[PDB]
Subunit: 250 residues, 4 copies
Amino acid sequence: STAIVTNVKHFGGMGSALRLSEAGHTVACHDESFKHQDELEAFAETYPQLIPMSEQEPVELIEAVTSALGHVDILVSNDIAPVEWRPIDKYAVEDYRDMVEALQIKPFALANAVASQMKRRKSGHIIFITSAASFGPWKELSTYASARAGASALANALSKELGEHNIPVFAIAPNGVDSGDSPYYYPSEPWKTSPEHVAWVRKYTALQRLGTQKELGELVTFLASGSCDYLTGQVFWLAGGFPVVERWPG
Amino acid sequence: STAIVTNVKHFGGMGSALRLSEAGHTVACHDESFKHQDELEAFAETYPQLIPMSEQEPVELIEAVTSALGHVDILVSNDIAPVEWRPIDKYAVEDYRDMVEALQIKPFALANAVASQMKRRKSGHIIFITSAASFGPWKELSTYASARAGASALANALSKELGEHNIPVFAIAPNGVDSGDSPYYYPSEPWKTSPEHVAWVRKYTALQRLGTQKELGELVTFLASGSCDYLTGQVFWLAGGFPVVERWP
Amino acid sequence: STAIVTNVKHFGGMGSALRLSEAGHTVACHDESFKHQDELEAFAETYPQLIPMSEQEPVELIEAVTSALGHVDILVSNDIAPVEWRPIDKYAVEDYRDMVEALQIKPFALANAVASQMKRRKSGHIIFITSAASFGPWKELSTYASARAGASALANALSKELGEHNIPVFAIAPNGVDSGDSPYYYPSEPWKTSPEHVAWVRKYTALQRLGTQKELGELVTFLASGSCDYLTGQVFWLAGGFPVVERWPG
Amino acid sequence: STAIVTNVKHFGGMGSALRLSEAGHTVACHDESFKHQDELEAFAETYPQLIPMSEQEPVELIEAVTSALGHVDILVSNDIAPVEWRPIDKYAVEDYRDMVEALQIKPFALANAVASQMKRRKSGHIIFITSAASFGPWKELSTYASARAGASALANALSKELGEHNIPVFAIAPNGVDSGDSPYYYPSEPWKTSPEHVAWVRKYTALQRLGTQKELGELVTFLASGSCDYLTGQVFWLAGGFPVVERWP
Ligand SMILES: [Cl-]
Ligand SMILES: [Cl-]
Ligand SMILES: [Cl-]
Ligand SMILES: [Cl-]
Ligand SMILES: [Cl-]
Ligand SMILES: [Cl-]
């Protein structure tokens, strides 16, 4: 069994690849930084069980993994883009195009690249990592929320067509997952260190903590296990019960 | 009150422009065909209460209207694309981009063009006409259903930023609305006349009929009326109770 | 055209009945206090256009209105019950039974009483007033949130069966609607007067105000107009964009 | 870790008890039939890893288990009622009360019985097995679909209060799960053997099969495992992609 996780250094990347590798999958990894062979090799060294690739675009990635490692059983589309808050009238339209490009066109492209081999084999699992920002409670986050909702809906729609070919499709919509060193999207600092941030988490999440990479990994790996294919089409709101607002005052 | 309805000849376009007009709004209408004087004037003539414009692109359309008529109070982004079923791998990625450009970047670009002027007065209404396909029961409609959910989510997200500024934002997510002569998306032929289509409707919708332009224009006009701004952020599933599924055999 | 609004002195009651009366409906009104003819008559006097009834239970109410005023075209089930926040282990089970009785059994009972005449006539509209507390962001509100979600789901399910008989069914799920003198659920005081409450509203709602009775009335009346029957099965979240949480701090 | 599964012979009951056991949990099982020594011991004998109890009522069942086994870490409220289609006016209000009592007051009463002890240790998991009927595509299932949504909403509401206390709460909302010999709700006959039922499944579910007990027990066991507490509040639509609707004819 062979899996690909994109953007492996950020967001859901490491939790997914590490937990998948432990489950006995051969895991190919993608990252922008794997353009430079310095970076690739420093990552191959640190992580001898993972298999990082130079390939950058969806179709050359799928073919490169398919050449080397067999045939893709699992796609984890771990999509990232900078959120910077701003009012609608300030954004340029070309900004929304880039947002949709990173968060929405990308997973479609990866699914579209892998789908016909999975269908031929009548097996595969496809998992988009999106965000709980979809129809979420934020303001001035509009380009981001909407592109993520695009990607979740794409997952749910694909499930309906690929079910016939025995391929479950899932979206994982996180909030408050500790991203460690990565800025996408809850780096240990300021989130574990700054008392103002720590107070925000305890205020608005039900479990009053950040989620761990390992939780995000365990979920990815359960979905990819073949244990619960019948959940196909589910968007999983991995957000520790966010949002939680307080009772009326006084 | 001045309103712009885009793609007025299609989908929800005529219901909206007509029902808005009938309530007192001054309605500027956009359409691809209005690129032609002849097509424009035929419309103007058939519809003397409406004010067809020729402009095609968001910034230019917004400014044309703001000149002619002084300001834009109401945006109805009546967005349309060809609903073509292919398996996901039968598509090219550029087809998804085109669908996203028509259904998602378009209404963003209109919103972004009119926003700062609505924000200045602390008043306005923004309505996106999307589709019930968004998180719906269909297969091989993957590009369409997901682009439509992006638009709907974009409306809901904007309602949250623009509420500060007293600007309600909505989406209307239709299914089965009789669109008369327009192929978007339920032309009266074959949907009122061909027994299978008639049957499909009867099977799968709760009220067992097509929806009407009037029903849709009435909703647009209600949301625009200022009577219930507090509904801001709502996505309206205008789908006659679709989908309905038979009991166990 | 004849309409009934229950619990007319509270929650959505007056906005609905007053706005419906203006639309040309003959409006029968129900209230617990109409048990005492003092109260009935003081209300009939104040509101000569409305038609208050003594009848208390669903079936005697429907028959009493049907006898006097013709035939019920519109039911507005304006359901109320005390919310008092509490942890699960504190509630007695019998409390949850009373909650479900008031918020869930009641609308079913009213629908079940009116449905067979509407179906015979192939016309009628049925509107439950529920709450945005359903799957909402509160904690320790659990009995209330769940009974309201029961009533919204009941509306959506009824729409699917009664559509065949040309009867649209709707739920209106409010939050932050000014209830004036009524404690159900946002009385002018403390909500319009107490600076702490005023600050809470401006914080967590998008429009940064309470909604008016008149807005809640206008919606009821549009749905009941016969203008947009195709919306049948919709739950309307009349909550001015609540909830809105703030950006990450710092 | 000690777990209670209610109504173990039905619906999601056997998948849960078996898969939990197989993972190491000590599983106490409840069932209406265990009111009978004979029925109880036949079960015990067939299933030596499980620990059938005789108690019937929430407070008494919770306390029986807490004595026998010291504490309750995991509650799986596997609730069942007869799914009988009548038009809404064909019902009596008391039938709705009974459905609500079985599907909604029951899991509340179990939650409320076990809560204070989970809260004391700051640990536990609560899982309600509800149904995808909740906001679903059916007609004349009005009592059932609405009671199931109440239960699901109750789980989500509790996840928000009990998170402070480190207690994850979930609902699992199934459709089309092969229930073997149980009539709740997809017995292998006629659903694996009768051509129409086989066809109905193939038409309306995405994966075109029934779901399995194993698939459901695996989910219960995963949620109970403590591996992904951060999913708390989730309602799981375990429905093979149901509903799926045909394209236009
Ligand atoms: Cl960022
Ligand atoms: Cl996150
Ligand atoms: Cl439509
Ligand atoms: Cl109260
Ligand atoms: Cl309210
Ligand atoms: Cl099932």
